[PDB]
Amino acid sequence: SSYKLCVPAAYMKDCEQMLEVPTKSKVALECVPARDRVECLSFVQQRQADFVPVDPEDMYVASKIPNQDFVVFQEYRTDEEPDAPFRYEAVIVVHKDLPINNLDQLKGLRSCHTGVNRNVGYKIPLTMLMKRAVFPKMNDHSISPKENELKALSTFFAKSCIVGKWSPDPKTNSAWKSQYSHLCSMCEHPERCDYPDNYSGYEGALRCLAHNNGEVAFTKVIFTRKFFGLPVGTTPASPSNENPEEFRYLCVDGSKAPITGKACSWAARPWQGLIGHNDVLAKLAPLREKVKQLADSGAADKPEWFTKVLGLSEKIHHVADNIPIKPIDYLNKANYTEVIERGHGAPELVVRLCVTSNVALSKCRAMSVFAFSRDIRPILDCVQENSEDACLKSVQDNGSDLASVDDMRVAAAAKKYNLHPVFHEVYGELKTPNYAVAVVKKGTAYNKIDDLRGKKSCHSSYSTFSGLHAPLFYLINKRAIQSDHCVKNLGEFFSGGSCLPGVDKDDVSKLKKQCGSDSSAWKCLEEDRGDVAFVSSADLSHFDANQYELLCLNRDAGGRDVLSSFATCNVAMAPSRTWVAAKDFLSDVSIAHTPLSLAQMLATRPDLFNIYGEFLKNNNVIFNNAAKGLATTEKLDFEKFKTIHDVISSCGL
Ligand SMILES: *[C@@H]1O[C@H](CO)[C@@H](O[C@@H]2O[C@H](CO)[C@@H](O)[C@H](O)[C@H]2NC(C)=O)[C@H](O)[C@H]1NC(C)=O
Ligand SMILES: [Fe+3]
């Protein structure tokens, strides 16, 4: 008989400290952990929890749960605008003398935007304008949905300022900034088209309009009012050099309205707040008093539970009780469901990820609904086969658009299904694939590969890339050993003997000769049973940084570098879990976009959706828990992986 608050598992301890905050309300709250907020909504519907903080995007996810009976019973507002129904209203701001009497006439104007993927300055304008025949269509399927929007904007407006990361892929973003440079010509620094830019953001858009001869600005009321020194909410009038009489809101009417009056606004971003199941009603006043009290006492400096558990913020923690409202009706009255459901015209593009298990299917579906609610496009669809090979076949057949493959199966999958890598996992704090490296003791006499001829080697297991593939390819490639009888010949290069676990299962007896009492590469190196250890960079924790170095077999100069420099002192880059796609359908940009937008949106917000976390007590579902990001696969890395595999297929290994 408590009010159960769902909380991302990572923040359970913070919710517990919160439960110790003294308050006048004696309401008992309990912390219910979930995998993330998306799961929390399921637990709320299922009554394992009673409420959870939500952004409007989360309410939308919540409104789609089959048979849902959610209720938004609490709004988080600002102290500046405690009585405003919406977080912020989107407005169109023009010079008073702009000849215009219809929103069709926004065409050809120089436009001032807050920045890409933002609400009043981008998503809302796109949502509303696209309803207008004069606005370019966005269903050209030779390119991605994101490119369709940018093409549409750069074709409708004469010039714009739309800064920021248009693509999560750096090279795609740069290429797009070149091809649609008109979208950056109104900015303070057009070549860069990124933050900081004095002509971007809520205020910079009005400066773009007032000071850089822009002709329309998409922004929000509060920055429009303050730009002109006008009062807003609790904020009083301010001295301003800008004169509001020279400017006007442009209304959907096509009419103009004074800035000094109530703004005409085509949509608003709704406030965040709390969502709960319908049985929270009736039991509703005591909870609201409890949350209000926690909000007003965490205001002072702001413990973790303030933001991570209650979903408040420094700027947004005025708890306002509303007339309880269903989530979609909450979103509707802001015109914000339209924005959340924005598309690009039929057929809406879909990227179909192939998964190999029921749990992965369910993770892909929860990820899809989240991505969609968060304005990431293409829509993610989920397709299930019963193996990796069947997912790969399906990508070939165009039953799917992408599928993952691990370790050294990427080159095989390309030979066999004519697929190619699109993006791969990166790891560590440096967000980097693993590398196969060559570990040596400090001060030993090896600086290049021929110096190790006749010597002894330690390896990771024969079944590993770094242990077997990379040293075998590295030697064969430099012709230090013939490519007939490769494993034997490897043994003949390290003629002093080697430990390559599992080489047993031609005459390969030399390659287990040094395994001694303990075949681990770090014990084998430590005990001078080998003079170099071919291991993965992922295993370098087993080597004392003060005693061991990397042999930079990759560098022209050879030599040595520290354990942490593996990314440039190595044998080969290691294939990480990789998603592959066919040749004749979605572009690599269209395929990479949604997963890399997820990875980058969720890198700091695993509480919203735990993309790399445990999923129903299963690890490494879709992504490995160790993944720290996603990057597009360079063609040259692809091509190198194919050559390595070709050498290994030659050896019959
Ligand atoms: C949501 O969108 C509708 C359609 O643009 C807006 O409807 C207008 O509402 C005004 C009141 O400001 C009415 O007087 C007009 O008749 C409506 N105009 C049109 C063109 O339909 C409404 O303003 C929007 N609501 C929000 C909160 O953004
Ligand atoms: Fe915004």
GROMACS .gro file of N, CA and C and ligand atoms in nm, residues 86 89 128 131 252-253 262-268 332-335 338, ligand 1:
model
   82
   86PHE      N    1   0.238   2.518  -2.121
   86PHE     CA    2   0.340   2.449  -2.200
   86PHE      C    3   0.479   2.496  -2.160
   89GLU      N    4   0.617   2.779  -2.625
   89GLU     CA    5   0.542   2.792  -2.748
   89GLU      C    6   0.636   2.830  -2.861
  128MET      N    7   0.476   2.144  -3.956
  128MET     CA    8   0.366   2.227  -4.005
  128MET      C    9   0.379   2.259  -4.153
  131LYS      N   10   0.283   2.013  -4.433
  131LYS     CA   11   0.143   2.003  -4.468
  131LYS      C   12   0.105   2.095  -4.583
  252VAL      N   13  -0.056   3.128  -3.809
  252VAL     CA   14  -0.097   3.031  -3.912
  252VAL      C   15  -0.201   3.094  -4.004
  253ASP      N   16  -0.286   3.181  -3.951
  253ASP     CA   17  -0.373   3.271  -4.027
  253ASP      C   18  -0.310   3.325  -4.156
  262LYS      N   19  -0.043   3.866  -2.687
  262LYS     CA   20  -0.036   3.722  -2.676
  262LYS      C   21   0.010   3.663  -2.809
  263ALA      N   22   0.113   3.579  -2.803
  263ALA     CA   23   0.170   3.522  -2.925
  263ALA      C   24   0.072   3.425  -2.991
  264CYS      N   25   0.070   3.425  -3.124
  264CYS     CA   26   0.009   3.317  -3.200
  264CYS      C   27   0.117   3.215  -3.229
  265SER      N   28   0.086   3.088  -3.202
  265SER     CA   29   0.184   2.981  -3.197
  265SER      C   30   0.122   2.857  -3.259
  266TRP      N   31   0.192   2.794  -3.352
  266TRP     CA   32   0.136   2.676  -3.417
  266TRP      C   33   0.156   2.548  -3.337
  267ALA      N   34   0.251   2.545  -3.243
  267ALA     CA   35   0.267   2.430  -3.156
  267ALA      C   36   0.350   2.470  -3.036
  268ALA      N   37   0.342   2.387  -2.931
  268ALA     CA   38   0.420   2.408  -2.810
  268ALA      C   39   0.489   2.279  -2.770
  332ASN      N   40  -0.182   1.616  -2.757
  332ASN     CA   41  -0.266   1.679  -2.858
  332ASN      C   42  -0.282   1.828  -2.833
  333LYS      N   43  -0.306   1.868  -2.709
  333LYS     CA   44  -0.345   2.008  -2.691
  333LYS      C   45  -0.227   2.102  -2.709
  334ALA      N   46  -0.108   2.047  -2.729
  334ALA     CA   47   0.009   2.125  -2.764
  334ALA      C   48   0.035   2.122  -2.914
  335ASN      N   49  -0.048   2.049  -2.990
  335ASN     CA   50  -0.018   2.009  -3.127
  335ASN      C   51   0.112   1.930  -3.136
  338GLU      N   52   0.151   1.551  -3.346
  338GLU     CA   53   0.192   1.573  -3.485
  338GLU      C   54   0.343   1.576  -3.498
  654LIG     C1   55  -0.268   2.394  -3.279
  654LIG     O1   56  -0.288   2.401  -3.419
  654LIG     C2   57  -0.410   2.465  -3.458
  654LIG     C3   58  -0.411   2.463  -3.609
  654LIG     O2   59  -0.302   2.546  -3.649
  654LIG     C4   60  -0.421   2.608  -3.407
  654LIG     O3   61  -0.559   2.641  -3.431
  654LIG     C5   62  -0.587   2.782  -3.431
  654LIG     O4   63  -0.624   2.821  -3.300
  654LIG     C6   64  -0.660   2.958  -3.293
  654LIG     C7   65  -0.648   3.011  -3.150
  654LIG     O5   66  -0.518   3.071  -3.138
  654LIG     C8   67  -0.799   2.970  -3.355
  654LIG     O6   68  -0.853   3.102  -3.341
  654LIG     C9   69  -0.785   2.936  -3.504
  654LIG     O7   70  -0.915   2.912  -3.559
  654LIG    C10   71  -0.698   2.813  -3.534
  654LIG     N1   72  -0.637   2.835  -3.664
  654LIG    C11   73  -0.635   2.746  -3.763
  654LIG    C12   74  -0.555   2.791  -3.883
  654LIG     O8   75  -0.689   2.637  -3.760
  654LIG    C13   76  -0.384   2.622  -3.259
  654LIG     O9   77  -0.344   2.757  -3.231
  654LIG    C14   78  -0.265   2.533  -3.219
  654LIG     N2   79  -0.257   2.521  -3.075
  654LIG    C15   80  -0.144   2.528  -3.005
  654LIG    C16   81  -0.165   2.528  -2.857
  654LIG    O10   82  -0.033   2.535  -3.055
   0.00000   0.00000   0.00000
